[PDB]
């Protein structure tokens, strides 16, 4: 079954580690669809940034793709 919908007010009520977990559980599968091997690394990189921006990325496929693309470029240069 699908994970539940995440809103700003819901996210805001949770402890800091829990907010990152809420965001990560939703980001990971979408990122993994794009980059099966780097998914874990990409997701951890993205979780470094602000939760309200991460929530926006979850609400806008275009926004998530753009961020993923930058993270991959960075990882590929390092590897």
């Amino acid at each position: 079954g699908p994970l539940g919908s995440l809103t700003a007010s819901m996210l805001a009520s949770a402890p800091p580690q829990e907010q990152k977990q809420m965001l990560g559980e939703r980001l990971f599968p979408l990122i993994q669809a794009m980059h099966p091997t780097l998914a874990g690394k990409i997701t951890g990189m993205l979780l470094e940034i602000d939760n309200s921006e991460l929530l926006h990325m979850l609400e806008s496929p275009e926004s998530l793709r753009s961020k993923v693309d930058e993270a991959v470029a960075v990882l590929q240069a390092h590897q």
């Binding site: 580690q17 559980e25 990971f28 874990g40 951890g44």
Partner: peptide, 15 residues
């Protein structure tokens, strides 16, 4: 450089 995220495992990047 940040810890990888693994579904269903507590992320160690902030805890």
């Amino acid at each position: 450089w940040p810890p990888e995220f693994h579904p269903g495992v507590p992320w160690k990047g902030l805890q």
